[PDB]
Amino acid sequence: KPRIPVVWIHGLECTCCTESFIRSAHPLAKDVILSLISLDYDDTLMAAAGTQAEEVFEDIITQYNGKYILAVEGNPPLGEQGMFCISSGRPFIEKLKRAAAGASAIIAWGTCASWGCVQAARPNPTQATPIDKVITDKPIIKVPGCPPIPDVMSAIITYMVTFDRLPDVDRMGRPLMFYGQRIHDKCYRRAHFDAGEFVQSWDDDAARKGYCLYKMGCKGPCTYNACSSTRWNDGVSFPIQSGHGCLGCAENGFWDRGSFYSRV
């Protein structure tokens, strides 16, 4: 049977969300691409460049108008008439708007597409702007995190393909399945938090016993994500398990909530 067309575009970004996607353990990103979806445009991976890539973009959004999913990594800058991000000699935002207009739905991968992420941190030199403030007439599913968890990205994809529907979302457009609870409400160090058992300086005796990172600035109490349950890289670890507090990286404006080492 034909696979669902997907167009994956890139604005201002670091490409962490593409890299996260290809880490997927189950299904492998290989199997997502060969068997689950038709990844019809993606600057990072496609053979064609230049005029050949422009022909792919135009052919897919025309032939599959109304029928493709648009994945967005990164975000558009409004500064300098949009020419902080140039694609085919024109502002990126024009490509975002053309791709959005034909899409059935939009996946905003990462904190960049969802909220703004690092380029939007003060003083936001480029006026980097999240997708939902530019595209106001399409369903947008926010999948935040810098980047999101690989097997969360692939589970959201498999949910959509298998169940033939968007995931149910919270009031911010995040999938309830992975963003319904806070890091701190599924954290294996919560016993230590409840007991007042805290790391006070790096590599102290508390640190060597896996005590709570709250006094080292952990933002798990105000951050919604699946890192403390699903974990990272085929379940191997997450920030807190390896001894660093949560930075808050799945939350809007997390770069500007103060030092990562200042307590909540």
Partner: protein, 581 residues
């Protein structure tokens, strides 16, 4: 039109202009323009970074301890290297010395990234320039098996395997949804592999796509996650506990066992899949040992990396050598000093920035990032560029120079520096590789040589992973567990005014972060990143950067199909988010 001479090239922008925008199978946003003469030879090349975010502006006023997390997000491909450069820079400014285990674990994080990044670049980014994926449908599975088995001990070589991979590709394209293969350059006359080598390479493309996800489990153990692991100023946050209560909350024997298992698997994949494929590309594409030389026979630069003596960044400590060569004089490897205002300088006369005097270069401690989008007299308009004007400002990339010289950085650069400094392992590796190809040493100074050196370096880094792991275990056997120094963690302990340099060799070349701290806050934070060097625009003397030079004098079989431009550009492994930051 104009013509001028620089670095032995004749830069001539008469004649037909070709535009490649977007450049794909890179990180980030790049535009390339060339002029070609009647003989389909490039006489002009223009490298343009088409993105900017402004991390150097965003860092101002932040706490130096937070800086690594911000600058890590310069790039998710070379993830972690900017965090390493950052903690180095802040420690250099404040006067912090980390414990040996923190230095060993940082060296493991960097070697892990070299392995991962180089492997993905070889297969997913550059590979389809060399491997004709659709031609793999014509291969004989048994001849494919026989070829693979002649080149490698790698177990996965049965005729049935190659048949199964070939049938997966046949099914994939059967519905007309060619995905990432759509409208490619397949059948271009520069595709030279036989069908059996295309099917072998395509099978390996898929094996590498799967396997790369395992490598970064080392980052997850020590750094929490990949992409974008965590770090601290003072060491690493991954406290160690082998034999005490609460080891379940720390890096313990089970976590170290997982790291060891990934190291072995990573070396085996690189040595038995990536290395023989790189050699096979060399065997079938020898003419590309003479294409894309660029600056690689003139000017190359390495800062050096992997300090083996903790907190010693000198020549006796760095396992990956530093040095610079200019004027093609490889008998004179020159020492690099990142504080010397006469050495590293960035120019913006051909970039979208403001300086008080755009005819001079500024050392990064005097750096300015004042963005100014001013493309001037383009063909088209400022929001609809048909042709950049390379006589004026044409890029978001600043132009770094070393003592005024335009330099190439990256795996070929490092291989040349280490070879000409007399590093025994580099000399042996390079001599054996070029002997197997029946090519002269000069053949590494090329687009093919960039790819061969990158594969070499993945093998080198896999070996160093074991070395660093064993050093860490030796410390733990001796009861040396420390991972952080915290006596200067608190801002009140810092100098009121100080500055530092953090440098390393990222997968793509020489990286530096220059940081000034004043009154507990970042006063200045300037980055010069490897793709900034290689993708550089011109300087006030008209001197061209590594990409523009490597594209000069290139023959194109079919002007409308930029396969030869993509081959040379991809051989440098461009990271445009890195280049612009």
């Amino acid at each position: 039109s104009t013509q001028y001479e620089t670095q032995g090239y004749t830069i001539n922008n008469a004649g037909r202009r070709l535009v490649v925008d977007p450049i794909t199978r890179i990180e980030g946003h790049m535009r390339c323009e060339v002029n070609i003469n009647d003989q389909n030879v490039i006489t002009n090349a223009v490298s343009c970074g088409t993105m900017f975010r402004g991390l150097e502006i965003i860092l101002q006023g932040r706490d130096p301890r937070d800086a690594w997390a911000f600058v890590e997000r310069i790039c998710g491909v070379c993830t972690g290297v900017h965090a390493l450069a950052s903690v180095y820079a802040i420690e250099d400014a404040i006067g912090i010395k980390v414990p040996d285990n923190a230095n060993i674990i940082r060296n493991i994080m960097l070697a892990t990234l070299w392995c991962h990044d180089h492997l993905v670049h070889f297969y997913q980014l550059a590979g389809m320039d060399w491997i004709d994926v659709l031609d793999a449908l014509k291969a004989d599975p048994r001849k494919t098996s026989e070829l693979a088995q002649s080149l490698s001990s790698w177990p996965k070589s049965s005729p049935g395997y190659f048949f199964d991979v070939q049938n997966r590709l046949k099914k994939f394209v059967e519905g007309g949804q060619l995905g990432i293969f759509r409208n490619g350059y397949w059948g271009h006359p520069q595709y030279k592999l036989p069908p059996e080598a295309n099917l072998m390479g395509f099978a390996h493309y898929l094996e590498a796509l799967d396997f790369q996800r395992e490598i970064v489990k080392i980052h997850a153990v020590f750094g929490g996650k990949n992409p974008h692991p965590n770090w601290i100023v003072g060491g690493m946050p991954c406290a160690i506990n082998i034999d005490e209560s609460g080891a379940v909350g720390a890096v313990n024997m089970e976590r170290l066992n997982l790291v060891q298992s990934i190291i072995t698997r990573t070396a085996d994949f690189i040595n038995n899949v990536m290395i023989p494929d790189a050699l096979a590309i060399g065997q079938f594409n020898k003419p590309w040992s003479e294409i894309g030389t660029g600056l690689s026979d003139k000017c190359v630069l390495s800062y050096g990396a992997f300090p083996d003596i903790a907190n010693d960044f000198g020549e006796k400590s760095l396992l990956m050598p530093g040095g610079a060569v200019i004027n093609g004089d490889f008998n004179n490897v020159l020492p690099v000093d990142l504080v010397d205002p006469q050495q590293v300088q960035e120019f913006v006369d051909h970039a979208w920035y403001r300086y008080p005097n755009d005819q001079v270069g500024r050392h990064p401690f005097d750096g300015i990032t004042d963005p100014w989008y001013n493309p001037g007299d383009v063909k088209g308009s400022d929001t609809n560029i048909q042709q950049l004007n390379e006589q004026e400002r044409y890029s978001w990339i600043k132009a770094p120079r070393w003592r005024g010289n335009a330099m190439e950085v990256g795996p070929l650069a490092r291989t040349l520096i280490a070879y000409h400094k007399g590093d025994a392992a580099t000399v042996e590796s390079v001599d054996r590789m070029m002997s197997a190809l029946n090519l002269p040493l000069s053949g590494i100074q090329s687009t093919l040589g960039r790819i061969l050196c990158r594969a070499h370096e993945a093998q080198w880094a896999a070996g160093k992973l074991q070395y660093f792991f064993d050093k860490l275990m030796t410390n733990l056997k001796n009861g040396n567990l420390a991972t952080a120094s915290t006596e200067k963690w608190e801002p009140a302990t810092w100098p009121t005014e100080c500055r530092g340099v953090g440098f390393t060799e990222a997968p793509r070349g020489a990286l530096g972060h220059w940081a000034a701290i004043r009154d507990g806050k970042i006063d200045l934070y300037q980055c010069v990143v490897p793709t900034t060097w290689n993708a550089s625009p011109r300087d006030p003397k008209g001197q061209i950067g590594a990409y523009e030079a490597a594209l000069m004098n290139t023959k194109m079989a079919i002007p409308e199909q930029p396969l030869e431009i993509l081959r040379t550009l991809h051989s440098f492994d461009p990271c445009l988010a890195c280049s612009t930051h």
